[PDB]
Design a protein around this nucleic acid. Sequence first.
RNA 1: AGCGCCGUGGCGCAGUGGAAGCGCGCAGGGCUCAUAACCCUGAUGUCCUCGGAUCGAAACCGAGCGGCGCUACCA
Lengths: 470, 23
Amino acid sequence: GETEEEKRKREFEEGGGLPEQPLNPDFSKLNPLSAEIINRQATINIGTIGHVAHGKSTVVRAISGVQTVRFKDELERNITIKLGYANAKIYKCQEPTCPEPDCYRSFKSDKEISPKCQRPGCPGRYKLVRHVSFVDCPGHDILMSTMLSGAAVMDAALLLIAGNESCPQPQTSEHLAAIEIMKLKHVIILQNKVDLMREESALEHQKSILKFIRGTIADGAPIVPISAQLKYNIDAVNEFIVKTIPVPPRDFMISPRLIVIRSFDVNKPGAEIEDLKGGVAGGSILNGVFKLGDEIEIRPGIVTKDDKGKIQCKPIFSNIVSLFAEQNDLKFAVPGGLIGVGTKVDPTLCRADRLVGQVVGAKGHLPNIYTDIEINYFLLRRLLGVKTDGQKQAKVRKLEPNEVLMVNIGSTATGARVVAVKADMARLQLTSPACTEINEKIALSRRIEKHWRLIGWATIKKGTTLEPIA
Amino acid sequence: VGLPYSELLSRFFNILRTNNPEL
RNA sequence: AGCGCCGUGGCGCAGUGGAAGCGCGCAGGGCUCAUAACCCUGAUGUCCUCGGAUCGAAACCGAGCGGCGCUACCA
Ligand SMILES: Nc1nc2c(ncn2[C@@H]2O[C@H](COP(=O)(O)OP(=O)(O)CP(=O)(O)O)[C@@H](O)[C@H]2O)c(=O)[nH]1
């Protein structure tokens, strides 16, 4: 006759609980499937993309069970500016008798190592196959830098298409193309609205979507039926994600860099400041291993304008007091995961949308900010994400010098001015400083119809740099 | 291919028809 | 979550320091041949829950209730 909390705590103890990561693992022997890595830190990053007013927080909640805030009391229902994050752990039963489509399950971040089987009729125990994180990209036309930032942090894609609306949705196509720009061909298609459709209409939508993707780069993207209200066939989503999406090559020989996209300070209001915490920036790992008690630097830094007007970018160097990976404060960071890096920086730096799309680096490494850069770019034929009512979907216009073009370097939102244009290369001056380390693939957006529209991809070749000031 | 999508389609419609026959 | 505010007699504001306040209300009456206008008299509650000071508190203070404006979703 124990209460619910006692039963769940007993299952938590019997399930192994949440192990603590040892301080100094033998790094050169660990893989993302290792027990020390798979228990507390994310390994595969996946994103949800779809049209507006379709529901990406609801499907993510059904998959995982972790809600997204969608804050500011006005963005709660229309669209979101910041990232909607959630944590999912994917489990499979260790018994062969269980149904393979249904043995897959997903649970919250606070779940134990081995939860009991929730299927009535089997005494097996679940096993965490692989750890994933889910990110909610904002699907609206006014917010385009956020989607490209998500593509930069995303390594897997989840497209959402509703049924009762128009089958060839342009925003879904634009998201798919922007993800293909990010060199990501591991995409999964999902049908958002299924219940209100008939027998024939679901197949009609399936054939329409099949016709939608025949000439694009995507080849083997599966189509999955799911409903965001009944909370069913989420095991199908986890199955498809585990089977189709592999782990990108990411190991210890690569240099540590991080790409910070969000910002959340830790400052409890009303509580005495004597019990506080430093400023925390939210960023993902694309290369390198991090540890508690290191020193980081935000190289774009404080951007000051002098009397002349030149950009003085002071790197913000700081000491990492805490490393957080999706459940608890841990020590060692595996490449390919989202982490809130907390340091002793002033809380003003981590409150608002300020550290949006920037890079940070550890000591012994000097990335370079740039002012004038050279980029090799190419376009497509038709505009994506626009609705031309049956008249010749607009074709991209050629770039013009001295035009404000939003050159999103992977995730960095920079407003570049063209100083020269040739057949396939361009030169741009940046007002907001942008760093370049190795490749940092780029997307380009322009403005004609009062908004920002993606036009094509871009890759940096050279540029004039400004060495950091001490 | 999209054939193994229709199997989950049929499973899900069976689930719905079991759930709410009113609609 | 931080503080600013509010807490009707029904709605809106004020007094806070001697215990029931107004305009709007509503009922009854008056003037008018008649109505509105105008003039009278009222019966509706814990001025949000619980305590300290005092002959006295609703007022001053204190140890929490629901909603409101900025700060902001603060791992
Ligand atoms: N009937 C039905 N409703 C759905 C389905 N999916 C989402 N919805 C509803 O769409 C509405 C949109 O709310 P919400 O998901 O929070 O907004 P959002 O998806 O975060 C905004 P954006 O798509 O730009 O990120 C919700 O009320 C949700 O219940 C669905 O499959 N079926």
